[PDB]
Amino acid sequence: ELGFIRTDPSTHSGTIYIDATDYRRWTFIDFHTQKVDSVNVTDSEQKEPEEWDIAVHRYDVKTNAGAVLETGFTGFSALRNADAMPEGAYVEDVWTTAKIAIDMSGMMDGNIVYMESYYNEELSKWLNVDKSNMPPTYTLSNKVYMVKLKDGTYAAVRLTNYMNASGVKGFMTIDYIYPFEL
Amino acid sequence: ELGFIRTDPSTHSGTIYIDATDYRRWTFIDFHTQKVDSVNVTDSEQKEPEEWDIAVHRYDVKTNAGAVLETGFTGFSALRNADAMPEGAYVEDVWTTAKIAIDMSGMMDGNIVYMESYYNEELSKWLNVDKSNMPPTYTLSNKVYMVKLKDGTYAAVRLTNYMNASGVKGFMTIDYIYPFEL
Amino acid sequence: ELGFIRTDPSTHSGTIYIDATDYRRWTFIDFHTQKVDSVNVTDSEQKEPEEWDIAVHRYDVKTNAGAVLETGFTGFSALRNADAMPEGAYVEDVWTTAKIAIDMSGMMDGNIVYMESYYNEELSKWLNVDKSNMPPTYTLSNKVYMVKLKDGTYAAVRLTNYMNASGVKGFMTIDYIYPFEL
Amino acid sequence: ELGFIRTDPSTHSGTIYIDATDYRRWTFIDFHTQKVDSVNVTDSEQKEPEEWDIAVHRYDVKTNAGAVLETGFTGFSALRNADAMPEGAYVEDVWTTAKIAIDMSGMMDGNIVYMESYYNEELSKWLNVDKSNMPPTYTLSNKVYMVKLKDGTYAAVRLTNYMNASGVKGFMTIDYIYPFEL
Numbered sequence A, B, C, D: 001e002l003g004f005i006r007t008d009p010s011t012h013s014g015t016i017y018i019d020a021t022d023y024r025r026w027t028f029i030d031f032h033t034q035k036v037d038s039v040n041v042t043d044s045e046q047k048e049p050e051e052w053d054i055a056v057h058r059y060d061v062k063t064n065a066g067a068v069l070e071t072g073f074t075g076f077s078a079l080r081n082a083d084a085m086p087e088g089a090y091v092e093d094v095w096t097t098a099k100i101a102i103d104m105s106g107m108m109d110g111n112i113v114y115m116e117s118y119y120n121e122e123l124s125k126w127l128n129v130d131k132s133n134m135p136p137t138y139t140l141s142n143k144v145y146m147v148k149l150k151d152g153t154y155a156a157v158r159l160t161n162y163m164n165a166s167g168v169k170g171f172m173t174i175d176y177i178y179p180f181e182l
């Protein structure tokens, strides 16, 4: 009951459910093979897999030389009715040095430890965390993201939830269509 | 390609797509039998069907002696992970005399013709039309609505879109789970 | 129900009623054969017919290598009594790249999607949509347009309405005389 | 990895490390047998164990017909050298209806869902969560709590941490001496 938990071959779709709670973890997702792999960045014996499509760290996401465009669609049944692909320019990952927090334990003292990493600003819009509010607000975009993968095929992805059943944050429920074809 | 357009018996779910564009029309939906029927309110020869679960008029919706509660869920994969039903009190339909517009053609002269009808204020939250803005904003709630039907069973419903593929308003894409069971 | 719905052969006149609601559609009108054909511009298996006189997309109109004069007449009874053909310059279609909207949904791309197309500016005056007001105001010109066709014959056309009986916009009621002769 | 992870039999002491992150869970600790058991309160096939000494739900704690004294000691070395048992009133659990949160998601119901439960107010002082600040401040008391068990034996407990190594809250590190004897 973690990873590719539900899949429907006839509609090329399914649901991924992963424990992205730990700040030391990247969870790699491969839509081609339906595999999920975790890497603890503080363990040099653990390396990223040879093949992967997206990677999630807490609410942050990166692609594997991919590009992403946020659509206006809020569900797959609406997306399947579209007549044409987007004309817009997809967004590639950017290199970051103060974005991916690997240790949050000293945050009450203003000390967050970061790692350097690629990060996709477009796909990470799947959740807006506005810390300036008391209390901070966690807002799902509810949008379908079109992800152009390095092999030229596309995945349609949507973050449907960021909590487990009782409200613990960092459990990510990701619906997908792969390969997405009009 | 109108009515119950996609259904998956194994997950008790599917998608309804209906032309709710005309203001004279009520479209009746029966999740039990997967049937859709239209009634032109200006034609006395057309009567409502003997059995139905929800009815849609443009963006307005009513139940057949049912009750509705808006959940916080924005997708079915999130809803299926819940451990318990809501504790809250569901909302029953209210009688209205100036809500259901059957003729909008004189609206530029401030004349709208209404009919008297039941209306569910909770389920109709599926789309918020704020006419006070220039231009008016059409905002899908994206929420899953729990509908307790008169026979004691439940349907989970979500309005995923209010437009056809080119943007014509009043075509409603409704995803559902019936019977919904934890 | 749709097309050349009312015709009077003794006067070579009638009324055309078309569903021009969809932004992907061009509806081709052939006054010579009293036929109407639709083409969904997103489906490359649907082709423009071999013969046609005018084409309508929502409120937009183009001709088939024709030319149009907005006459001073606001009814057919006065036009039928004219002793000479109306004076003035007949205006040919112009090319446009941001006039014919084919996707207004804002879903695949946030912006309106336009197609490149010929467009008759004179005949398109049959309806003025003033967007500078909120709500925008829709004013029928009530003028009779003379359309000089490529074979040298003439059609007289007048848009009498742009909504169906309940106020759904995009249903076009067009009165015509073809072949127009003094 | 979890449970009684470090023990020193020569001093009857050790460290308990538990995943108390989930709001549906009660983790039962039995100092007599060095066993830990979890119960998901939403699953009626999971029952409380026959024997247990204290139980933890996130930062909340209750006893098994026990009683607790927050002593003045802030370390075990000084406690082990005490010449008499600490003075003060041992405090029994109190009944609560809006203290033990079992669903913090706001999904089925917008409000927090609480369960009715016993709760030890004295032992729950091991962590102070001051919600009147934004961000809320988490202060460990660092005190040694003496827990008088129903069999008349005593456990000394001290919460040394409430987060895992990356800052994920709800992982509880509890140092203990059982059976505590002077």
Ligand SMILES: [Cl-]
Pocket: A095, A096, A097, A098, A099
């Ligand atoms: Cl950065």
Ligand SMILES: [Cl-]
Pocket: B095, B096, B097, B098, B099
């Ligand atoms: Cl009313």
